[PDB]
Amino acid sequence: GPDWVVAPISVPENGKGPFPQRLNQLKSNKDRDTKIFYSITGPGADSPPEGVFAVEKETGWLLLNKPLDREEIAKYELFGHAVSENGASVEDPMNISIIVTDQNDHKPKFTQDTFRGSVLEGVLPGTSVMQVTATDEDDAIYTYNGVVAYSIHSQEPKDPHDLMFTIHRSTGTISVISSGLDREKVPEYTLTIQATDMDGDGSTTTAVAVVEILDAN
Ligand SMILES: [Ca+2]
Numbered sequence: 001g002p003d004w005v006v007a008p009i010s011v012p013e014n015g016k017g018p019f020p021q022r023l024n025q026l027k028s029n030k031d032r033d034t035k036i037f038y039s040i041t042g043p044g045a046d047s048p049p050e051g052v053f054a055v056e057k058e059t060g061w062l063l064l065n066k067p068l069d070r071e072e073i074a075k076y077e078l079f080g081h082a083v084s085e086n087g088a089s090v091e092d093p094m095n096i097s098i099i100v101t102d103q104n105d106h107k108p109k110f111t112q113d114t115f116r117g118s119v120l121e122g123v124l125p126g127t128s129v130m131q132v133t134a135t136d137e138d139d140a141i142y143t144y145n146g147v148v149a150y151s152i153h154s155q156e157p158k159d160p161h162d163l164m165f166t167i168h169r170s171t172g173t174i175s176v177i178s179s180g181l182d183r184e185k186v187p188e189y190t191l192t193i194q195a196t197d198m199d200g201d202g203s204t205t206t207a208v209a210v211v212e213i214l215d216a217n
Pocket residue numbers: 013068069070071072105
């Protein structure tokens with residue numbers, strides 16, 4: 001490409017290296033008759049987090065010094081500088097954008113350890129009981145890394161039967177699917193709920209929802 005220009009640079013988080021890793025070689029056309037010293041400034045270089053990026057003074061290689069974490073900082077905006085050996089700036093500072101792209105490195109996290117809800121004993125099958133939620137810090141815009149699917153792992157007790165409830169795989173709303181709820185017989189159920197990223201193909205996190213059965217009064 002042309003000298004003293006750089007399009008956005010993408011770097012997946014959690015790279016293996018080796019570090020320091022070359023990202024791009026800065027070059028000023030003024031090097032044709034002059035020795036140039038390159039430098040970088042900006043958050044990530046000379047201000048917090050300091051020293052994540054560096055530039056080789058004479059070669060102009062922009063380096064990444066460690067693996068990045070998209071959930072800490074998703075984008076860096078740095079400036080490249082070119083100064084002659086005599087000490088004169090020979091270019092206007094150049095904007096360097098570093099875009100940290102995602103990896104699926106977070107499991108879903110339920111918003112509560114115990115969700116508590118209730119439902120009347122005589123409701124029609126299909127009646128909504130309550131809603132549970134799990135977030136996922138990963139990207140859900142370009143991939144399914146941050147897209148959660150819900151499921152019910154188990155119900156306690158299994159009375160009158162095994163599965164009295166279901167859950168909406170994307171909204172987390174729990175509904176009644178069977179008849180037979182009766183506060184006098186079984187006043188409470190404990191549902192083991194799961195949230196799985198990659199829209200159900202990834203890693204799973206478990207929590208519980210406790211459902212109180214209310215008297216028809
Ligand atoms: Ca991360």
